[PDB]
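Cross-posted from the bioinformatics board.
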Amino acid sequence: RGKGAYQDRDKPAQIRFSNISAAKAVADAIR
Amino acid sequence: MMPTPVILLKEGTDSSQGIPQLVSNISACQVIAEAVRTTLGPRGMDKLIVDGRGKATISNDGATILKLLDVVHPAAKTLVDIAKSQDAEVGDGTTSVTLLAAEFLKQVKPYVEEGLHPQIIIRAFRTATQLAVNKIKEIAVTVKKADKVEQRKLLEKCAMTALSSKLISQQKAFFAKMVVDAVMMLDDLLQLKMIGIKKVQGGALEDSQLVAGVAFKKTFSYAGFEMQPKKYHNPKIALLNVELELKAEKDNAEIRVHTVEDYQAIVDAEWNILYDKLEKIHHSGAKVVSSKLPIGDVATQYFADRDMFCAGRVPEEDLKRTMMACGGSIQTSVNALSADVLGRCQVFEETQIGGERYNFFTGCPKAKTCTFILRGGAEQFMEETERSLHDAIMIVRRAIKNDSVVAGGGAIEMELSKYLRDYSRTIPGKQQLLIGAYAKALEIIPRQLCDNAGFDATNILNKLRARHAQGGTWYGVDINNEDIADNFEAFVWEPAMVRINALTAASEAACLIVSVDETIKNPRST
Amino acid sequence: TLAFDEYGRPFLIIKDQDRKSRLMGLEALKSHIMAAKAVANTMRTSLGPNGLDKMMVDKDGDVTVTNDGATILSMMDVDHQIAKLMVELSKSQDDEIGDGTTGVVVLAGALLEEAEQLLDRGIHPIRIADGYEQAARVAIEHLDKISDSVLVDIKDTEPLIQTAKTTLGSKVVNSCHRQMAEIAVNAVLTVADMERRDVDFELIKVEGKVGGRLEDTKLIKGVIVDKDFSHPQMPKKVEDAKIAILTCPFEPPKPKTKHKLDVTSVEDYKALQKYEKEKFEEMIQQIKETGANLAICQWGFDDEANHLLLQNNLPAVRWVGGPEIELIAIATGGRIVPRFSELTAEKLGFAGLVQEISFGTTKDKMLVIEQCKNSRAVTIFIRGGNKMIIEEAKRSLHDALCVIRNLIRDNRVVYGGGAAEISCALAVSQEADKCPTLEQYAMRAFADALEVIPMALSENSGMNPIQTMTEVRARQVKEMNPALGIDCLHKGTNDMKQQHVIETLIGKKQQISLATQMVRMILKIDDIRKPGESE
Amino acid sequence: APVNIFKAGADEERAETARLTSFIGAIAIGDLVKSTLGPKGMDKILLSSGRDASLMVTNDGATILKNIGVDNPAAKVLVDMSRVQDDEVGDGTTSVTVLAAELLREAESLIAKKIHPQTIIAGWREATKAAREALLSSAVDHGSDEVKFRQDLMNIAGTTLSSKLLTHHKDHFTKLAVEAVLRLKGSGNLEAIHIIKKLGGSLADSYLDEGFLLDKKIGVNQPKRIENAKILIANTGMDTDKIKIFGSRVRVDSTAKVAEIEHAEKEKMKEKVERILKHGINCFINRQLIYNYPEQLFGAAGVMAIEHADFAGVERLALVTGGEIASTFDHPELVKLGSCKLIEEVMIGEDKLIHFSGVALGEACTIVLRGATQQILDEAERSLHDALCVLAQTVKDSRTVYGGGCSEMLMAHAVTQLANRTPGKEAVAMESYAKALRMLPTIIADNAGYDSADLVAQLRAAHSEGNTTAGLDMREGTIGDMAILGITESFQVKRQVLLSAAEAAEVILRVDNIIKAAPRKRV
């Protein structure tokens, strides 16, 4: 069995990745 | 503030003159060349251009790039018009010709700013051009093994080379073999109108097929064409320009009836005339009846009950190819039909390649035409494939009749610069600065063949200079090993005419730019 | 610079150059891959037995809820030249095979996503595209190694029904999981040509009428048309039909050309009145002389004809369309007769019970044919409680019919549930190190991309992709590689041989080939020239 | 109401949208901060419209809600509630916010059942009283046996901090909170523990300064280091004294008298400094600025002087040095001095600060807070402020309750057992009160990602049959004993969460009609 199930459907689903992309945009700016 | 007469001479006309106008004209040529700089060589990239309709074209051929750039500068257009000619005369001479022609101007650009009147430059360009062209003729190689496997291998190597810089990686052996054999199907005119290419969506590149005969796409039909089975093992083909509708009229007749006896006679006569034509078509064996004109419901059922197949509304382009593919003739009137005008083939079937219905003919031994069916996963994917087939056919067609070939890559361009330098070092005076400039521009080809994919451009060009000055002159730039390779021994050959015409067109382009001192632009534009 | 030269003069090369945009570098390549991520993120949400549906709202306000990727991607308003190609990928798969409308987008996206690191490592954009070909050949060659079938298309149709169940299991019609699987098998095998392995798509018609339930969907061995008997008191039941298919109106024959009858005398006026009356009688008796007892006419009737049809006990319907009379004539073994005077018994159709069906309070009067003689055409009649489930049911049965046709074309199958994809990823990895000349990074990237499918399936199934993938991939190596896949409810074990998860070999072969070619033609681009504002 | 309107520019809502929009707008507040409840919650970033946007990253519900700018006149009711919770105890601000929201959500469901709003309120009043008894009867006391009392302070400090940025640094910041308070041994001023924020180093590199740090470096011509210094603080004038005569001018016949008066001006400033120096001092701190003239006099005397350390800096120095403000110096024998060991300057974060080390009667301290970024420093500072505020009260009221949802289930149990003894007209409302109480351990598990379907059932089943210490084990995802694990909360924090949510929630239920005055300054 999977021993539980949790549905994660909320605004953080996109933020957790958007913040990383913004940081990459600057990190490469001075490469 | 100066041209302020009480009465104007013309209207409002713009006029430039002198050194800034020549520099501007050369600069415009340098900028437009940027559109193809990255398209040269086996490792060039493709470009995506969107037109005003919203449709994109993906291609890398200079003859398709330069026509979509919307060039307006009077001078930049010069490097486009010469592409229009090379597309006919040569084929491969696209990106290479544009880049060389632009470089011819760059090499003299830093000098034309400070004296050096173009009258002396034009004469030097003509001298250097004639020298370079003669040198090609003295080094081109030929074969004496016509009508042998040696000529087949020559044509195959020409095709595999022609397929370079395309959307082709491992399919060269697949397409190249069919291109060479497809052309050998033609008569001794090698007229390209005898080779059709048709796109059918669905499947991979390796799933394409070369059909010795022809096929049509099964256009608009009527109720009753679900019948007429599509299994034939020895059909005859009637190509007719006859109307088989009940409503066929002369458009200028009126049938005036005064009694019931003639009323019915006209009604029956209209049906009888149609049946008369159909019965004359029958008793011929022409189990396949094709026409560019409509075939109506009555004829469809007549043919079905007679165990015959028909299909109308066939375009004239395919009927003419069908005539040449089936070995027959096209007859307009049915009143003189016989067995001596019909075509013949062995197999006639309706297939489902890609989901759409296609009616294929094959088996005629006297097929003067052929059709190559392309399969692919997208419209643009097949469109680019079609372009690669047109160029490969063009190079092979020419190689059959002209077996004079030269080393590919930059190998010939390095030798041409060597010959010109040997010439220039025997000439006194101002010519040393002009013949050399022509020669220096010739290295743009081995340079760009490296800049687009690395290969340590600085040092690999130095190697070509060291090798060609001491040993053989067939050394070029490899793709697999990042160093020099002998293109002659590797059989990397291109028709001699590709470079001969490239030199002529590039030279004339330079003379059109440097010979202009003034530009006059009428203000009337609405 | 443009529009400014070193001499202060304007510098104009192309028309409206100030409204153009060009950016090459590696930014064109990253922009293409990034845009593809937006596409892949859409389709990954509808993969697997738990795939979620999309609601598509058309420009006119019409709304339909579908699962079929062909209906989702075809209704997009995306103005991006490469994202449009991602739709064409799903189209090519839909036209050739008809199954992987979701798979080819997810796979192609993974190849673009995994390629992102390869560009950042400094690998030439074209070397990446070529490297995928070296790895793809490995997956394709091994895909054809494991395959077996016992389907003969005669009576042992058990694996054929199972294939239909595998396909339909992803749709919204699982309330008819068995019923629609059996309908699809019977629909194709009764019209398929076993000699050539061809199935003519025109021999299976799909009709429907709103109302009832999915469980009321039936396969009718015959044709369904809109019945409208010209005479309202005409009996509505024929027990043994002798059917005359006619394409001529029941009115006095007229010429096609300009006529303009000249009438001068009273004898001419009155004589015509008699002759026309006789024409009405002859055209009806010419039908009865053939033994016909039901006429089906493309054209309408005169008022005079309807009375004669009654008195001669000759039922008939009116204004039956082109494709309807074409199908009726074929289904009944008859022929279309041009005129009344060409009628003969040899061209009559033969059929059994002819009836019209009334539905609730409406006046649809749909045809049912009970019995037929060696018919080569069938009709499916779809019911449903709303317009959306019926239209989706049409697509659900379409997919089921397509995979049956694919097995007829090629009877080689593979095991699904991710077993084929994981096995291919393992095979490529084993050969990825034989030999790591330049392409080591690219071939491994291909192997990783192949796993996007069992990983997305695991996510939609509610499982952790690391806990699931690490177990299956280990089990397929520790022992002789079984057909071990994944599932949501596990059904006991994940042995695809016992779950009967069957997919077509030629389907997956096309998914790999078409996805690879689409990726290549959009990687090898470094310049986009799209126009901006009009002015 | 909408028919025959007699209002100028105002509007009103009655019985239809007044309650609907009030419940929607207010309940939304709970969902906003719901994600911050428990040890595994995520943090928020709040952004301004511009003009030095001053980005804030924070967890605490009070700092989130007080910066939103809620416009809905009913939602503002709960915003003010969360302010009061922050001002009173400084913890549980998320718990009281989401509890009130869950109570209101149930009220809307009860209105849908056609239960009169006064019946719902009456039921909640009885349920609230039942919950209050559950807290009174379950409190844990701590008296003497200091080896057990100190452990309680460590448990309270650990619990509060576990919910903030300072998660995996508990082994450093727990001691900074508990020991800093214990060293005060006096009034909970909450200003005797100063925090200095510096960039550089990690959070784990923070430390407690045993002494007291001052700004405003040691003078120009003054000793930089004196051992065994006597400290004098002052609040007097250094120059421009203008002694107490308003409207006085110097009016002379010649400038010779002006020069003579100028000498007298300096002679009195010299005397003033001498009167201070007779105290026998080594270090002088004056609130008011030091001018060029007394600076030379203090330097020549070998005595350092600090100017304007802060407005309240002198008051803080008085508490940590053991002296007096001394705004006037006229009886040196009546003025008490302080004493320390070192007055040397130290380098902290590339900034020289004056370090008073070894100070007698040092009833104060400074925490030196280090971090990589400004957002880390600001949130870490708030975490210290929150823990110190609770600890300053725990040392005054030692009653605690068991956390981890234990107290919440005990309250819900008492409400349920008594609700079943009441008639249905009101029992349906008392049961809704208990249901809201059980939402808190549900939210905590749901934020962490645990299967709340089993944790809630197991916790309720445990408390149904004794096990009055059972609660959530947020490390393993099971039910554990709160006493053994050491998960406790301050009694006063839990009492106020219960009472505040009930009192605030009634405000919304009582309203059936909202009348909105015409807006001003909107064009």
